[PDB]
Design an enzyme around this catalytic site. Structure first.
Site, PDB file in Angstrom:
ATOM      1  N   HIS B  41      66.663 -51.722-101.842  1.00  0.00           N
ATOM      2  CA  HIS B  41      65.511 -51.383-102.723  1.00  0.00           C
ATOM      3  C   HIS B  41      65.087 -52.509-103.649  1.00  0.00           C
ATOM      4  O   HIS B  41      64.118 -52.297-104.408  1.00  0.00           O
ATOM      5  CB  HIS B  41      65.734 -50.077-103.467  1.00  0.00           C
ATOM      6  CG  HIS B  41      66.831 -50.085-104.468  1.00  0.00           C
ATOM      7  ND1 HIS B  41      68.110 -49.592-104.207  1.00  0.00           N
ATOM      8  CD2 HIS B  41      66.813 -50.449-105.768  1.00  0.00           C
ATOM      9  CE1 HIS B  41      68.850 -49.698-105.322  1.00  0.00           C
ATOM     10  NE2 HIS B  41      68.088 -50.229-106.287  1.00  0.00           N
ATOM     11  N   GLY B 143      69.540 -52.440-113.898  1.00  0.00           N
ATOM     12  CA  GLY B 143      69.921 -53.832-113.631  1.00  0.00           C
ATOM     13  C   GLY B 143      71.291 -53.966-112.984  1.00  0.00           C
ATOM     14  O   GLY B 143      71.621 -55.098-112.567  1.00  0.00           O
ATOM     15  N   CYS B 145      72.436 -52.405-110.247  1.00  0.00           N
ATOM     16  CA  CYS B 145      72.452 -52.232-108.793  1.00  0.00           C
ATOM     17  C   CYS B 145      72.932 -53.544-108.136  1.00  0.00           C
ATOM     18  O   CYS B 145      72.583 -54.664-108.599  1.00  0.00           O
ATOM     19  CB  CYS B 145      71.081 -51.807-108.285  1.00  0.00           C
ATOM     20  SG  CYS B 145      70.807 -50.071-108.696  1.00  0.00           S
TER      21      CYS B 145
END
Ligand SMILES: *[C@](O)(C(N)=O)[C@H](C[C@@H]1CCNC1=O)NC(=O)[C@@H]1[C@@H]2[C@H](CN1C(=O)CCc1ccccc1)C2(C)C
Ligand SMILES: *[C@](O)(C(N)=O)[C@H](C[C@@H]1CCNC1=O)NC(=O)[C@@H]1[C@@H]2[C@H](CN1C(=O)CCc1ccccc1)C2(C)C
Ligand SMILES: [Ca+2]
Ligand SMILES: [Ca+2]
Lengths: 306, 306
Positions: B41, B143, B145
């Protein structure tokens, strides 16, 4: 969201750990530039322990009597001296992994990460607090002496603790990196009671703010208190006095949450007087005192280290 | 002695963290040899989130659209592909700090360390468990991920988790390093309930053995139980069934302490039925389930990593 007992990333410290052997004993050292720092009782034997004569034991040791290994590569010792309860072994090779560093002496109630090491190799990393009685409640076995505690700020490692002892009560004691003990302890097997420990009240308040930030709000009551009235209750439950300095340090968390410091103090007073009635706060069934205000702000804002 | 929630030393993983930006989004990647692994993503925008068409979004991206930074040194992307829910970005430079590593898919109830990172830089390290419902109760902000979870064995990093999501309930979900989610979750904003969580019974038993090893023995009762009778009580308190495999895995802790597994099960049955009556075990007022039998043996024996 979520709130964990987070340690500092340990890599900068991992690159500094070595093994030090002087005849018998092997323990850990800290290798920074061309100096290895370790506990001075590396020079002791079994019989030496009630009251070692560290000066006499050291006069009888040669540079070459210290076997220093950095990942089982020997570092040649070219000088040695004693500073309080540590040795400083000068080596002929500077550590190329030396980080930017400082030696600091922390205050009771401040927190740090410990990198627990054996034979110069890391076992694990965990966060703790310096108790008000200058002990730590750590996880240290035989062989862990010379493991260090530290904080990081941007790129700079602040070393604050080196491990030396486990008292008969099963709590831990050690020195700053200048070799001065925290607390009224000595590096010998002799009677040495720790003072009565207290709860770090400013840290409990910080953690209650962390709970609010993370949506765990059930304990907020509708009251306020005076600082003096809060402190009369703190005293009764063996909590440290809350000072104006502490109130000022909690101001940013107060602004983030909309909860005045003395309003939070009224919620903590009710928890002390009535308990938690089987409820948890951030997954704990006790009031947690090992997070400072700065620890809460760091974790809740994603502060990183270079 | 002492028993802490110990994380693995993080240095081997720190040396692998990078930042990945694709137009808008910046998140973390894992740099191993000449491949950077990150959540797919990174290629999404605000409007894409209810049901992103990841294949269509990726067909429209160039190698050069991926800005990979290793401590704000750009790594040139020379290839990209999608594997389940991760991207693999081939770079023209192999990471010289690549450790010996494996990708593993862990089982529910196993533990690992998370290195929480922002913009490719580490914030902190903590130990957790993979819940029986395939969520983790972590500490992850926007932030984070691409942060990873891992175990170490001697010199080998086993990567088991990459962070992707925080569900509406405030728990965390992610993938293995082949990009397959743990649990019935998908990388889109859609209804996706976690299953009911349970308590990891073999881990609670392990922790009670840890307590005995560390001299906290008050909860030991004088009884025994059958496995089947223990499991009827476990069921009632939303504990996982204890299997013979679990009994066998607890055998070494049973031998170290002299407490038969089914005798410990009788002590746990009494704690479930009667509670702790305001007492603690290893400093906790709840029964702890985030230590495996192997975690207890490692910590209590000083196991180190090379
Ligand atoms: C450390 O020397 C090592 N090699 O790891 C060791 C660590 C300690 C063992 C058990 N867990 C630990 O954290 N430290 C010691 O063994 C120190 C050294 C002598 C005795 N000692 C103690 O910890 C015992 C302290 C004690 C105080 C009062 C009464 C009786 C014992 C030294 C030199 C203090
Ligand atoms: C991650 O993308 C990042 N950049 O850090 C982020 C981490 C997340 C933010 C808050 N704490 C965290 O752990 N993950 C996301 O924002 C993911 C991505 C879209 C939405 N999302 C969620 O976490 C929301 C999940 C959700 C599920 C059901 C219903 C509503 C929302 C992706 C692509 C899943
Ligand atoms: Ca020689
Ligand atoms: Ca270019």
């Amino acid at each position: 969201s979520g709130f964990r007992k987070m340690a500092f990333p340990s890599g900068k410290v991992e690159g500094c750990m070595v093994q030090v052997t002087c005849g018998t004993t092997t323990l850990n050292g800290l290798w920074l530039d061309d100096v290895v720092y370790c506990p001075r009782h590396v020079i002791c034997t079994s019989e030496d322990m009630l009251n070692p004569n560290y000066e006499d034991l050291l006069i009888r040791k040669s540079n070459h009597n210290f076997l220093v290994q950095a990942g089982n590569v020997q570092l040649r010792v070219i000088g040695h001296s004693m500073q309080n309860c540590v040795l400083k072994l000068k080596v002929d090779t500077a550590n190329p992994k030396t980080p930017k560093y400082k030696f600091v002496r922390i205050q009771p109630g401040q927190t740090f990460s410990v990198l627990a090491c054996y034979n110069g190799s890391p076992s694990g990393v965990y966060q703790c607090a310096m108790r008000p009685n200058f002990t730590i409640k750590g996880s240290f076995l035989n062989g862990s002496c010379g493991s260090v505690g530290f904080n990081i700020d941007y790129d700079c490692v602040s070393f604050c603790y080196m491990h030396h002892m486990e008292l008969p009560t099963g709590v831990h004691a050690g020195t700053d990196l200048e070799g001065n003990f925290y607390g009224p302890f000595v590096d010998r097997q002799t009677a040495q009671a720790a003072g009565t420990d207290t709860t770090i009240t400013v840290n409990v308040l910080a953690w209650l703010y962390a709970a609010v930030i993370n949506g765990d709000r059930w304990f907020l009551n509708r009251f306020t208190t005076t600082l003096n009235d809060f402190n009369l209750v703190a005293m009764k439950y063996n909590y440290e006095p809350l000072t104006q300095d502490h109130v000022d340090i909690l101001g940013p968390l107060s602004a983030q949450t909309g909860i005045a410091v003395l309003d939070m103090c009224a919620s903590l007073k009710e928890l002390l007087q009535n308990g938690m009635n089987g409820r948890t706060i951030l997954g704990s069934a006790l009031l947690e005192d090992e997070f400072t205000p700065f620890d809460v702000v760091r974790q809740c804002s994603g502060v990183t280290f270079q």
